[PDB]
């Protein structure tokens, strides 16, 4: 292991910036290892380390505080978060949007929500890569939180460079699509356990690649309307509606988007009474989509989240 | 003299008991869970609010009922006689609950914890104007359209503490030309029209109160389908009514709230979403498993629900 | 009597052990979860009742299961073949752990459940006393159902022995139930109509069928012949049939369909037929169950009922 350690608050004091933000608008516990990403572990209590954009962070939360410090892969000596580091951390939290506000107007308009959402506040969206998103969401089908962070882990060991160890903890960056899109990366991915969600990932790398003409079409569906976007994305080699809707909600700033599948059926028919007016279908599932939109507005993404956290 | 909001041991030469175990009532249940709107617990354990024009403080220890009466003597046996009709104690909640739970498994697993849940016999005039003016939502603000309209339109009782007691209005006030504005002021929107023109109809028919006090004694189909004659007053209010005041235990109000219920907990659908048609058919599904007193094992799973 | 139900701190000498994780075995949600109806705690952690004509009495460690034996003879510790009939009685060859995690991979409302519930398996009852038990099940709960079994044992089953103020007797023979005053008497015992199908599949079962060695035929028969036959006795419908299956011809597949199953079908897997309970829809509602959980979904089943019963 490395002489380096994972540093906790009230250890390494000088290191550590603050945002202020009311543990009702985030609290990290809720959101860091719920399902939306996958590389953030809380390595002591209360600390939650991961990697943002080839950077570590550790982060941890007072009632009103968020408390980060960054760890640099380079010579630069040991140096406490700067000003545009902070900015990208409130952008990644969405700090913008008053959850407060959104609580009331869905607790406004469905019951069930206000009785659920109580115990379970300061559930928000992060503001993923859509990189990192789709690719993670690839891995997604036929899947649990555990096994996909296992697949996530050494997808980036394998194809994403060294960044610092801290531990027994080595930190890679999410790798960039020319990494997964090589002749190796189906035969290697297959190696580390990915099975048949390997060929996706390279399909999708070449496509986006060639077809496409690279990352940048990925900024321009965070651009482009949900429609066109969820689209788009369902035209890529191991993405379908429910995967498209995740990426859309978590990385194309769509939070309309309500990813539909067996989970959201039986909330949906146990919660609501919701049957299809024409078992999942294409069809119904799309309907599912439009009668949460209908019942909690533009946000109602967000307000699914808030389920999801309650339900489990 | 600057008079108080009684309790038991502060008073107890003004308090009258009625036999009458927890399990056959509770207070804290049945007083503020949306059937009456006038009652309110102004010190821990002790329920204060009007009946008939005059008002009463109500606590309970495990075995007895006590209440008190503002009009200082202890409350008569007449006064007392209004209160048994009034939480209609004649009717047997034990053998009800035994008798839902034998034939709903789902009934006797939730009403461990919520017994003593029974129907108040509410005045029809105030339980009537009461239904219409909500909008059906939440019971604060139907608590506080009805203080409102008490202070504006009935008649001054008694003031204890800092809460002025005021009588539920007779038709005539309701009635009046003035009537609609003032309610519209009161926050009522468009059903203020439906109160003055509620009024003025039951006005119309024979004598107000007497039009009413029929359809108590006339069948619940026949009560059910005259009520639904009013302005502002359809099939879910028409229900509460018949339930609250027309001595019609196997009226079940069905609104998204019952067909939630029904759904999740007893798996119906309509052999036939909310439609007239199939609401009728939920509330005859609970009179099916339920019997005659559906309306009260309804009232059970709502106070269980709600918590 | 003066004879004394034990504990596993009052007598160690007369306990022997079955090495047993309590994750393949919880006494606790298994033997009052209505499969038998003839286990009581009657000592904190302490499970007393009758297998074939003999008391037992029941603990178990984190590790270890605990039993102990009453037979007039003398005071002994239960004997290896005593163990065997224990260990079959329990299914033990079969493992939980494994059945667990397949069901848990194809069906994600059955893993978060099974967590906090785990060692919920199906007991080996004898076909006899599991068919004229199942049979009081029609319209009723565990506790009436207890009642209704303790007081036909103890007025046609033949005394076994005396533990403080319980006096245990044996499941009634077929030749008991099939007398004459037998509808009569069970009656008084207060089955009242399951009264009539007791002593008629009793009859039904000597005269019709030529005894038990019928029963047995039926736990060698395959699922849905041994169903059908079972179906053929008065009182015996597809839920008591399945009953009876599962818990006592060795059929795991055997899913018995009523309201209660309904129920969870519908709230916890969205289940409606394909087509209220019906007979047909009972049978379409047991099919989605093996097409789900496989060959065991009875087993899976009864992890689901223990988990509601909580
Ligand atoms: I709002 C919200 C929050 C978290 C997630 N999480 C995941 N959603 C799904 C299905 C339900 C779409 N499947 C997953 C499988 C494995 C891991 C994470 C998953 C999605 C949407
Ligand atoms: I796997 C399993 C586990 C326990 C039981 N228990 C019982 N199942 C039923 C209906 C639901 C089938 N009804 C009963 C009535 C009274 C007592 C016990 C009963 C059945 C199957
Ligand atoms: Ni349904």
Not at 56 to 72: I, K, N
Not at 76 to 98: A, G
Not at 281 to 300: D, I, Q, T
């Amino acid at each position: 292991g490395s002489h380096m350690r994972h540093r906790t608050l009230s250890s390494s004091p000088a290191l550590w910036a603050s945002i202020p933000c009311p543990r009702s608008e985030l609290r990290l516990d809720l959101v860091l290892a719920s399902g939306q990403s996958f590389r953030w572990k809380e390595q002591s209590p209360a600390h939650w380390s991961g990697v943002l954009a080839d950077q570590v962070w550790t982060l941890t939360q007072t009632e009103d505080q968020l408390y980060c410090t960054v760890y640099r892969g380079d010579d630069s000596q040991v140096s406490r978060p700067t000003l545009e580091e902070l900015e990208t951390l409130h952008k990644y939290f969405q700090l913008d949007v008053s959850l407060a506000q959104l609580y009331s107007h869905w607790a406004s308009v469905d019951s069930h929500f206000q009785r659920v959402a109580q115990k379970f506040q300061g559930v928000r969206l992060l503001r993923q890569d859509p990189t990192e998103c789709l690719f993670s969401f690839i891995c997604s089908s036929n899947n649990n939180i555990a096994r996909i962070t296992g697949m996530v882990e050494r997808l980036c060991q394998a194809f994403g460079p060294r960044l610092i160890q801290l531990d027994d903890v080595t930190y890679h960056g999410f790798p960039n699509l020319h990494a997964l899109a090589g002749p190796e990366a189906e035969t290697h991915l297959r190696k580390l356990g990915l099975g048949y969600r390997a060929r996706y990932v390279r399909a999708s790398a070449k496509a986006i690649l060639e077809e496409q003409g690279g990352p940048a079409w990925l900024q321009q569906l965070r651009v482009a309307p949900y429609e066109e976007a969820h689209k788009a994305l369902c035209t890529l080699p191991g993405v379908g509606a429910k995967v498209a809707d995740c990426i859309c909600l978590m990385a194309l700033d769509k939070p309309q988007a309500v990813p539909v599948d067996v989970h959201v059926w039986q909330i949906a028919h146990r919660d609501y009474g919701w049957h299809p007016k024409t078992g999942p279908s294409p069809l119904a599932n799309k309907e599912l989509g439009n009668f949460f939109r209908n019942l909690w507005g533009p946000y109602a993404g967000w307000a699914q989240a808030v389920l999801f956290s309650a339900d489990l």
